């Protein structure tokens, strides 16, 4: 009886509506992000769109600024709003402070907006979790995850959405300094992270690759094919 209002505390001090908003994130396609020394990658599974529909409008990885990008989970309707407000915020921050927006700052503002939307009745929580990464630290790669609650955290590597637990365990098992020593190895690591929960062929794995002082580079199907071929070569070498 304590889960029908956002501003009502349960006897054990639980805001159950916020947790129910969290539950919507787990119903979205997985997004995997891992940062390297000179690379930040955003793995995303595709839902194998209908044969008679265009994928161009089902974009899940979007860039807030010229050098910060985010991948979300949960409902697309809330995610689009969050991304639009984040873009407006980074542009406004550039206007007031000529320095480019920081990935930490944009993460903090996204978390603040989510928190403001889970602070009163008559405002449904944003049921999306965002994986914000970027080289905005001017020489330092950063990765961030915003829970729909309004809390953000810095992760060396993290996963959100359906099957996030398995990918998180995988990454905890093999995210090492040696694994991310080069960009190609980091991209391969993203590929192995996404393969286990997304079993399928090509076009089901979308990777966003951003290099230092560069722009977002959504890998074409040919590139993910060559990387998955490389992974198959590695596993056949292992056997």
């Amino acid at each position: 009886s304590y889960d029908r209002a956002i501003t009502v505390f349960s006897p054990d001090g639980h805001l159950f509506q916020v947790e129910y908003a969290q539950e919507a994130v787990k119903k979205g396609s997985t997004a995997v992000g891992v940062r390297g020394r000179d690379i930040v990658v955003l793995g995303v599974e595709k839902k194998s769109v209908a044969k008679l529909q265009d994928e161009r409008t089902v974009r899940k990885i979007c860039a807030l600024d010229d050098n910060v990008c985010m991948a979300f989970a949960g409902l697309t309707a809330d995610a689009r709003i969050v991304i639009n407000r984040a873009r407006v915020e980074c542009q406004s921050h550039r206007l007031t402070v000529e320095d480019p927006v920081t990935v930490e700052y944009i993460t903090r503002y996204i978390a603040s907006l989510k928190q403001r939307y889970t602070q009163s009745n008559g405002r449904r929580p944003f049921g999306i979790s965002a994986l914000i990464v970027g080289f905005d630290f001017d020489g330092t790669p950063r990765l961030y995850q915003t829970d729909p609650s309004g809390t953000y955290h810095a992760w060396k590597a993290n996963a959100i959405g359906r099957g996030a637990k398995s990918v998180r365990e995988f990454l905890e098992k093999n995210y090492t300094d040696e694994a991310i020593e080069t960009d190609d190895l980091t991209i391969k690591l993203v590929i192995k992270a996404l393969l286990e929960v997304v079993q399928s062929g090509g076009k089901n794995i979308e990777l966003a690759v951003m290099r230092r002082d560069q722009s977002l580079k959504i890998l074409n199907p040919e590139e993910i094919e060559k990387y998955v071929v490389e992974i198959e070569k590695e596993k056949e070498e292992n056997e």
Binding site: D12, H14, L15, V18, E19, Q22, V25, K26, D147, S149, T151, H153
Partner: protein, 91 residues
């Protein structure tokens, strides 16, 4: 005439119940029963006995004759917690 309420035990009461139900148990000497009591926030004495029984069962599963504090931690998990993103908001 007198209506006595048997509310859920507090931390001292939960520790006392843990000591009561582990007196016959073959436990180690370094078990922090206060920690176990704190890990069961709202749990009855029956749940404490179930935790002790499950700790003994865990230490029986592996061929060990002494139930370590790790077995009690696993039993607390299995009894209270079994029946992370939600806990991410609290810190």
């Amino acid at each position: 005439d007198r209506k006595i309420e048997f509310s859920l035990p507090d931390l001292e009461g939960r520790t006392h119940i843990f000591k009561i139900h582990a007196r016959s148990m073959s436990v180690e000497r370094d078990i922090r029963f206060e920690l176990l009591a704190r890990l069961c926030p709202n749990s009855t004495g029956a749940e404490i006995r179930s935790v002790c029984t499950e700790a003994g069962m865990f230490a029986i599963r592996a061929r060990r004759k002494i139930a370590t504090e790790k077995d009690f931690l696993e039993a607390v998990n299995k009894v209270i917690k079994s029946y992370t993103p939600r806990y991410m908001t609290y810190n």
